[PDB]
Amino acid sequence: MSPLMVKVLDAVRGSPAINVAVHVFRKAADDTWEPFASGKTSESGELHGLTTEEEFVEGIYKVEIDTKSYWKALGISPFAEHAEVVFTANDSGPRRYTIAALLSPYSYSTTAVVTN
Amino acid sequence: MSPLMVKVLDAVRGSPAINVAVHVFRKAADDTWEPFASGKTSESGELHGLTTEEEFVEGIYKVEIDTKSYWKALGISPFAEHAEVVFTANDSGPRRYTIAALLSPYSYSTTAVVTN
Amino acid sequence: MSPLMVKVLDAVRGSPAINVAVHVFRKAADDTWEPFASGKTSESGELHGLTTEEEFVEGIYKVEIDTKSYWKALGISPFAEHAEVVFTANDSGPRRYTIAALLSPYSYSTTAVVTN
Amino acid sequence: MSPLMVKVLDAVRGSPAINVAVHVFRKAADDTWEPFASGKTSESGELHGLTTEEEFVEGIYKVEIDTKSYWKALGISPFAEHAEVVFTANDSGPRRYTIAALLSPYSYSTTAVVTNP
Ligand SMILES: [Mg+2]
Numbered sequence: 509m510s511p512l513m514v515k516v517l518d519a520v521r522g523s524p525a526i527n528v529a530v531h532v533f534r535k536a537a538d539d540t541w542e543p544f545a546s547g548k549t550s551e552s553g554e555l556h557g558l559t560t561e562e563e564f565v566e567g568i569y570k571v572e573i574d575t576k577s578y579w580k581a582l583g584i585s586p587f588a589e590h591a592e593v594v595f596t597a598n599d600s601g602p603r604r605y606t607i608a609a610l611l612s613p614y615s616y617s618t619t620a621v622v623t624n
Numbered sequence: 625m626s627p628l629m630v631k632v633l634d635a636v637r638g639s640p641a642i643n644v645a646v647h648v649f650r651k652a653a654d655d656t657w658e659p660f661a662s663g664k665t666s667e668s669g670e671l672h673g674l675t676t677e678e679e680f681v682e683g684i685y686k687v688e689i690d691t692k693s694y695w696k697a698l699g700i701s702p703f704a705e706h707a708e709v710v711f712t713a714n715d716s717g718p719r720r721y722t723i724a725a726l727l728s729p730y731s732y733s734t735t736a737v738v739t740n
Numbered sequence: 741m742s743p744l745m746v747k748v749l750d751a752v753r754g755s756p757a758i759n760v761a762v763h764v765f766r767k768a769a770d771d772t773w774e775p776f777a778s779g780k781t782s783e784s785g786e787l788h789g790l791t792t793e794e795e796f797v798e799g800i801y802k803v804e805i806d807t808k809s810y811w812k813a814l815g816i817s818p819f820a821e822h823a824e825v826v827f828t829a830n831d832s833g834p835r836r837y838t839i840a841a842l843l844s845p846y847s848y849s850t851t852a853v854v855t856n
Numbered sequence: 857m858s859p860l861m862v863k864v865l866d867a868v869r870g871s872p873a874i875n876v877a878v879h880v881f882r883k884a885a886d887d888t889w890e891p892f893a894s895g896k897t898s899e900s901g902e903l904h905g906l907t908t909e910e911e912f913v914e915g916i917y918k919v920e921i922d923t924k925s926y927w928k929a930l931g932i933s934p935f936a937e938h939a940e941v942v943f944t945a946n947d948s949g950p951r952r953y954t955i956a957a958l959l960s961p962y963s964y965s966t967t968a969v970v971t972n973p
Contacts, residue, residue, distance in 0.1 A: 517840060517851060517853060519635070519728050519730060519731035519849075519851045520635075520636055520728045520729060520730065520731075521729075521730060522703055522729075522730030522731070522851065522852045522853050522854045523853060523854065523855065524853070524855075568937070585947070587638060587941075587943050587966075587968040587970070588941050588942060588943050588966065588968075589916070589942040589943065589944075590942060591966075592940055593936055593964075594936065594937040594938055594940075595935050595936060595937055596935075596937065608749060608842075610731070610840070610842060610849060610851060612635035612636060612728045612731070613635070613636055613637075613638065614634075614635050614636065614637065614638030614967065614968050614969070614970070615633075615635040615638075615726055615733070615965065615966065615967035615968070616965070616966060617733075617751075617842060617849065617963060617964065617965040617966075618936075618963065618964065619749060619751050619754065619842060619962055619963035620754050620935055620936060620962050620963070621749060621754050621755060621756070621962075622754045622755070622935070622962070623755065623756070633967070633969055635967070638968050638969055638970040639969065639970070639971070640969065640971070684821065703827055703852050703854065704825070704826075704827060704852065705800070705826045705827050705828060706826055707824075708824040708826060709820065709824075710820060710821040710822060710824065711819055711820045711821060712821065726967060730851060730852045730853075730854070731849060731850065731851035731852065732849065732850065733847065733848070733849040733965070734820070734823075734847065734848055734849075735846065735847040735865070735867065735958060736819045736820075736846045736847070736870050737846070737865060737870055737871065737872065737901075738819070738846070738870040738871070739871070739872075750962075751867070751960045751962055751963035752867075752868055752960050752961060752962065752963075753961075753962065754935055754961070754962030754963070816868070819870055842963070844867035844868060844960045844963070845867070845868055845869075845870065846866075846867050846868065846869065846870030846871075847865075847867040847870075847958055847960075847965070
């Protein structure tokens, strides 16, 4: 399976957040953010298949979740453009990284869940 | 100033939640809940003056926040009925507790900032 | 499968919150809280099999997640006794309820995810 | 008073996060991020005086917070490496914004309370 997964909940409607675009970036040697993977959440609010064990090498990764487009599709103009998290992926730690985001228009949390 | 302050905010609108009823109870030695203090939030979403240092001794306190009436006044019939925060106070000596309840119709977040 | 499920994450350690006790109550005619179901989260932070479609009738339910014992087991001082979620189950309403809780010692959210 | 205020709190300790670096940028017409204002949170966890009602015009603003240094100064090595939020301000007239970042080592919450001047 992908070592990096994303799950998104809509805390206003009490449902998975479906069709949310997610972009992942990796810091390059020149300190710029290089695009790494993208996708959108399914009907369960999950995004699987972003990357592979081979490709998900150690590095600094940025996960950006496009929450503004999600809310705007529901008719709402929310506070932020995105939810984001930056973290270092490490070969020593637990293998699987799940970014869990809980969304409301004016408050949201992004949590990294690192497991085996 | 009251050693217990409660603030209520709306996560959907990004606004203070005004006129929200807040009821505080203290657990008695016989395990029942005794009414302890109550009030309604102000225009800033804050409820000041609930109690005093002299009254607010160690104990288990329950803060019940009438979130149902608040949503209903905005034309929403919420899923999350009433918010309830239960905590032990002053166990290491008197502290000032600010409890913030952030509301949506299907979720709430409770945050405590505890100072000297 | 149980029409009421609970999933719990630890935001301090970035992990599922394992072995968290959960107690569910249903409001009785005398306005008291009847014990209804209980269990504890598994290694995945999920609690399955709490109740059945037959047992879970309309009513007012309280889900208490025993977060104080969880933080004590980790050596981390907590704020609350537990996280509570009170809701009315109406038959016109939702078919499956999942309570998703994100926990830190001094801040926590509980979200009802209502699905079919 | 500044119509943009940023507050940072610690969800592990239940305390204000003191002396935390906060950077604010505003998106220019050429799509670059221009430095707008910065400072460090005070003993209440709040950073006051960032801007004024005259200077804080409509635009896209970015608030970036050095949460990693905050945790390290407390003896904690965090997993999340910073906090960052981008938002359009004053799109429907001037507002006052309080942005609160609530931190733990593996998570953060961003909340905006938006009021009239
Ligand atoms: Mg004692």
